[PDB]
DNA sequence: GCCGAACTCG
DNA sequence: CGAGTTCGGC
């Protein structure tokens, strides 16, 4: 799809929410991808479960949470996928479980998921600044008015 | 850190 | 009703 539709995709990402405040599992892990994608870290469209995904969404996470939300990369990696860009590619053996799995924790994500990957399109545009920069402001639309101030 | 259970969103 | 979170006993 288009960069239009992205950026709209990007401002919706449906995260869970809890009495006005949302979850930024979703947006703190989009905007670790980018981090990762501007350092040249993330060469090839394939994000793997690792210490260098887990270390980046930390540091963006950090900047989001509040003292309610859980350091829980598991859970964004996995749910991510209802976005319709952000894909798993499925271990060996695995597809018939893949199916009703839970991102319930990190051996879970480990059985089934090989590696994470982003429509071709979504992943040649984020090479680009302005496109980060961009689809970076749409993701701050996740989040309500009332908690800009802690949550931004 | 696991996952069944609980919770809230919509 | 399912999605996407946190909780709690282990
Ligand atoms: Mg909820």
Do not use: C
Request: glycine fraction near 4%.
């Amino acid at each position: 799809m288009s960069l239009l539709e992205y950026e709209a995709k990007f401002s919706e990402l449906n995260p869970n929410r809890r009495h006005g405040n949302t979850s930024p599992h979703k947006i703190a892990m989009l905007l670790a991808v980018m981090d990762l994608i501007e350092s040249g870290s993330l060469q090839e469209n394939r994000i793997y479960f690792d210490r260098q995904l887990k270390d980046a969404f930390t540091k963006r996470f950090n900047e989001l949470k509040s003292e309610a939300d859980r350091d829980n990369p598991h859970l964004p990696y996995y749910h991510l996928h209802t976005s319709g860009f952000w894909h798993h590619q499925v271990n060996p053996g695995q597809r018939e479980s893949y199916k009703t799995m839970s991102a319930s924790g990190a051996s879970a994500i480990d059985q089934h998921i090989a590696y994470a990957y982003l429509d071709e399109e979504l992943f040649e545009l984020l090479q680009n600044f302005t496109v980060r920069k961009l689809l970076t402001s749409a993701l701050d639309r996740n989040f309500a008015i009332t908690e800009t101030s802690r949550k931004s």
